[PDB]
Every structure is written in structure tokens, then in C-alpha cells.
């Protein structure tokens, strides 16, 4: 994974969003792709956001879970996103109707209109873990393929599995 992004890339507008719920494995995730200085800033508090800058790849990672008075903050970050990578825990099944919530309150805004959509069906390296094709019916994704393009990729972020095809797959979809 080291550089990876750099030799896909190489320096496009590219402004990622990496959410999804506590536990998912979203910062697991970002340290693996080995993207550069992390900056961890608290723009206000309550609300602990994760970024790091390539070229001109740029990451913004963050919880969704609660604390209203922090959404319209969240809708500054949302302004000029490229893409939305959606980190779901695969193997938590009594928690993915709280993940699907927070996805549709997110991937649905106006300032995401149109938004490139990654979900990451994580921890697939887990016993039990839902099929992508499940988490397809689960979160009744068909309801976003009039306006967004989507894939939900398998992943095992403690390996890097499917991390390498979901830079590609997000590459291969933008300018
Ligand atoms: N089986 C499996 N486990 C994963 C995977 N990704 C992360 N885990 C683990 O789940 C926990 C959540 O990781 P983290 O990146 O902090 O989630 P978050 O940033 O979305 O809150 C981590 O363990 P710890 O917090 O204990 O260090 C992490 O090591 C995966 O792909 N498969
Ligand atoms: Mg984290």
C-alpha cells in the first residue's frame, strides 16, 4: 500500500469523506494507505476529524453516531467532496440499521449531490459477516442508483484487502 495512492493519482482533485459508525475500522484504514502527515484537528468539540493530504488527494475521517450542534459543521466538509467511502462493521449485524440511518442522512444531502459512494463491507474476515450482495438489500441501496454512483467493496482493513480495488474503483470514476 505504500504510495499506491500517489502512482494512481498523481496529484488529480480528488476529496475523499471516510465515515461510518464507531468500530467500523475507518482509521485503520487510513493509516494503512500510508497517505502522508495526518492531521488530527477538532474544529469544534464534540467532533474529532482525521485528515491527511497527498499531492492533491485529501482525506476527512470521522465518527457518525450523534451530537446534532455539529451537523451544520459537517455540511462545510461535505462542500467539494469527491467521493464518500462508508465504513460499515460486516460482522455487527444488530448494529447495521443504525449504520444505514446515519449513510442516508449523509450520502442524501444537498452538498453530496451526485457523490461518488464506497461501502466498505469491513471485518469480512470475521465468522458471520453479512455477504455484500446482503448489505445490499439490508441498506436498500437500489434507492441511490437514480443519482449516485455505488459499489459496496468486501474489505479486511487489518490486511489491506480490498483497499488497493477501492482506490482503483473510486480512480476509475473521476476526472
Ligand atoms: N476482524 C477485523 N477487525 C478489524 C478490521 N478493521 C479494524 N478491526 C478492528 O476494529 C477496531 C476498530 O478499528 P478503528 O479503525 O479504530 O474503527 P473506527 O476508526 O471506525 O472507530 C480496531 O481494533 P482495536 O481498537 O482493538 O485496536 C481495529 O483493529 C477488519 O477488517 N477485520
Ligand atoms: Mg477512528
Redesign the pocket.
Known sequence: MGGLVSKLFKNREMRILML???????????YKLKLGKTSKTVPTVGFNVETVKHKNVSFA?W?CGGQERIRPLWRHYFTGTNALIY?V?S?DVDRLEESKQELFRIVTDKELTNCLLVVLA?????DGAVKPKDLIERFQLNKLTGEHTWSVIP?????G?GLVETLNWISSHSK
Open positions: 461510518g459508525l464507531d468500530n467500523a475500522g475507518k482509521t485503520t484504514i487510513l475521517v465518527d465504513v462493521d460482522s469491513n471485518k469480512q474476515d470475521v474489505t479486511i482493513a487489518i490486511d484487502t
